């Protein structure tokens, strides 16, 4: 016995050939094992077969201010740029101007943020 809200979550036309003891814990255990088995089969089948995010606010801020309009702000920019290129920039980063506006996101965080953007814009056992 499983409720109507569960019955529209799993894919339909499944036949039950056995009688399960009454109670909620047995129903939820069977559904949980079913989700586990389907994900295992999907990953086995998938294994048997054959992106820099930037910040809007910081980019707008650093584009808003200008050096080079006079010697004073130019010299301030030169001094900061010398010291920052010495100690702040790491070798695999390619530019100081590029990483001052880079949003420093990890790989899983940017994948989940792409997925949530795709959800807000518009599998088998995920719900």
């Amino acid at each position: 016995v499983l409720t109507n809200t569960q019955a529209t979550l799993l894919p339909t036309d499944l036949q039950t050939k056995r009688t399960i003891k009454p109670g909620l814990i047995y129903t939820n255990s069977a559904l949980r094992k079913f989700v586990r088995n389907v994900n295992t089969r999907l990953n086995l089948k998938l294994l048997n077969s054959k992106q820099f995010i930037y910040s809007k606010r910081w980019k707008s801020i650093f584009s808003k201010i200008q050096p080079l309009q006079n010697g004073t702000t130019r010299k301030s920019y030169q001094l900061f740029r010398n010291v920052a290129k010495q100690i702040l920039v790491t070798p695999d980063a390619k530019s100081l101007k590029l990483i001052t506006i880079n949003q420093k996101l990890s790989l899983k965080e940017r994948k989940l943020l792409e997925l949530r953007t795709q959800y807000n814009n518009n599998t088998l056992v995920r719900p």
């Binding site: 530019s95 101007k97 943020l113 807000n120």
Partner: protein, 363 residues
């Protein structure tokens, strides 16, 4: 809006590089209905003042008209097509150049073709010309992947053992815009599309045992995308590496402000649109000299009219062309070979050509 029923195999406006029978097959399979018949055509007209090849004197006017005609009809999935290509109409008197062009022209030919759409946007055909009675086979694969689109065409003839390939890609090319992150709404912001694209095409013809007998290549670039990409690269990767004393010379930071402006929300620095650059070059023709054209697709001039200015260094010719929807009025001028020594290379020979598709005139 205003999306016309263009050829799914042709890519380039105002330029054709396909056989007319395959354009007829692509137009027949481009029908919205599941059955019907389609027709297509091309024509070009050359008008000039005739210059004699012997004494360099003006004799008269030479008008020539060349025509391509295609017709097809479609069953449940197949198409049958009859085409009449390369029919030349000649007017003029006492011209060895007209006779030499008549001997070395594309011959007026009639063609049957039985085409089968064997997969969706994947076609195969067997054609057989009737006047010269020669059979040949052909295949075509077109594809769309989001932003970009590709087309490959193969023609194989065992009589002359001729192998022709045509290939084209329409793609947005290099991208400079950033994928932003909105700090407030916790969502990404992707750059919007422009609609403008770069086109790359190649033609490769083998006639006989010459394994590289002919090869032509062409590249068509949106200028605004290239200028904005270059300005973005200079502003983000080069400007921090300029030495300091460079800015102390007069007027140079202000000049850098005019050439490279500040960044904004839509992430374009220079608002350039409608300008486009064509570089086309063939290898079988001698000298390795390019054909370079600049084009403006202005919307306000006669409804999307394109004004084109072109140069070829092999024929030393310049061209001014007005084009709209397959109509093309092109006046080209030829720099003749000058006299033996000193200030004698002047501009003569204006020549007006008209390209038309009369079934494209109904739009």
């Amino acid at each position: 809006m205003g999306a016309s029923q263009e050829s799914e195999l042709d890519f380039v406006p105002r330029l054709s590089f396909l056989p007319i029978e395959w354009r007829s097959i692509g137009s027949a399979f481009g029908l919205k209905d599941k059955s019907g018949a389609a027709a297509n055509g091309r024509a070009t007209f050359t008008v000039r003042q005739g210059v004699d090849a012997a004494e360099l004197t003006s004799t008269g006017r030479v008008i020539d008209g060349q025509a391509d005609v295609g017709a097809s009809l479609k069953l449940n999935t197949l198409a049958i097509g009859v085409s009449a290509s390369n029919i030349t109409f000649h007017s003029g008197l006492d011209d060895p150049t007209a006779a030499a062009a008549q001997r070395s022209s594309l011959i007026p030919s009639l063609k049957l073709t039985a085409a089968k759409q064997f997969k969706r946007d994947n076609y195969i055909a067997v054609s057989y010309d009737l006047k010269h009675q020669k059979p040949e086979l052909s295949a075509c694969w077109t594809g769309e992947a989001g932003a970009d689109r590709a087309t490959l065409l193969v023609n194989v003839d065992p009589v002359m053992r001729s192998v022709k390939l045509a290939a084209a890609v329409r793609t947005p090319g290099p991208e400079w815009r950033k994928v932003l992150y909105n700090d407030e709404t916790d969502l990404l912001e992707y750059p919007a599309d422009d609609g403008a694209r770069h086109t790359l095409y190649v033609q490769h013809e083998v006639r006989g045992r010459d394994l590289l007998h002919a090869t032509r290549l062409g590249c068509r670039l949106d200028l605004g995308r290239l200028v904005n990409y270059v300005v973005d690269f200079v502003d983000y990767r080069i400007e921090e590496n300029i030495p300091s004393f460079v800015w102390n010379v007069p007027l140079l930071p202000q000049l850098y402000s005019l050439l490279v402006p500040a960044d904004n929300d839509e992430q374009v620095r220079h608002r350039i649109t409608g300008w486009e650059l064509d570089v086309s070059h063939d290898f079988a023709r001698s000298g390795l000299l390019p054909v370079v054209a600049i084009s403006k697709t202005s919307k306000k001039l006669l409804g999307g009219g394109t004004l084109t200015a072109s140069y070829d260094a092999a024929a030393r010719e310049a061209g001014v062309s007005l084009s709209r929807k397959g109509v093309s009025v092109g006046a080209r001028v030829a720099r003749a070979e000058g006299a033996a020594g000193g200030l004698s290379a002047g501009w003569g020979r204006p020549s007006i050509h008209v390209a038309v598709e009369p079934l494209g005139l109904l739009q």
